[PDB]
Design a binder for this molecule. Structure first.
Ligand SMILES: [Zn+2]
Length: 151
C-alpha cells in the first residue's frame, strides 16, 4: 500500500512553492517581525527536536505545519514500534537555505526517524505525504524536507 519515496523524489511532482503544492513564499519571519505571531510552539512529547541551535526555535511553526507534523508523529510510531518522528530543522533565522525558503517562515521541517536509520527515510517521506504535508521531498540521504501551504 505504502510505496516509499525514491531519493530525490518529491510529491506532488512539481516545484515546491507552486499552487498545487505548498504555494508561494509569503516572506521571511524574523523574531522582530509582527508576522512572528503566526508561529506557534509544538510541544509534542513524542517528537524528537534536535534543537542544534539550542534556542528551541525548531518548535516554532505554523498551526498547519504543527498539525501535519503531529499526525506524522503518530503514524511513525505506528509504522515502527520503538521509533519516533524526529525534526533536525524547522524555522530558520540564519538563512541556511535558498532564497525564499519556507523554513524562513515556519512552513517547513527537515525530518528523520528517531533512530536515524536512513533505510527508513523513503518510507518516512511517504508517511509524511499521507499525513497531509503539501510538499514532501526526499531532499538528501540524511533528511526529508516537508512543507505546507500558508493559512
Ligand atoms: Zn528543508
Amino acid at each position: 500500500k505504502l510505496v516509499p519515496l525514491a531519493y530525490k523524489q518529491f510529491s506532488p511532482n512539481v516545484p515546491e512553492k507552486t499552487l498545487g503544492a505548498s504555494g508561494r513564499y509569503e516572506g521571511k519571519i524574523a523574531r522582530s517581525s509582527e508576522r512572528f505571531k503566526e508561529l506557534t510552539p509544538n510541544y509534542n512529547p513524542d517528537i524528537i527536536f534536535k534543537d542544534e541551535e539550542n534556542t528551541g526555535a525548531d518548535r516554532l511553526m505554523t498551526q498547519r505545519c504543527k498539525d501535519r507534523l503531529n499526525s506524522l508523529a503518530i503514524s511513525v510510531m505506528n509504522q515502527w514500534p520503538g521509533v519516533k518522528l524526529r525534526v533536525t530543522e524547522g524555522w530558520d533565522e540564519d538563512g541556511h537555505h535558498s532564497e525564499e525558503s519556507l523554513h524562513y517562515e515556519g512552513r517547513a521541517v527537515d525530518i528523520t526517524t528517531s533512530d536515524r536509520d536512513r533505510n527508513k527515510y523513503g518510507l518516512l517521506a511517504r508517511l509524511a505525504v499521507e499525513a497531509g504535508f503539501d510538499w514532501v521531498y526526499y531532499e538528501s540521504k540524511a533528511h526529508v524536507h516537508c512543507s505546507v501551504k500558508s493559512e
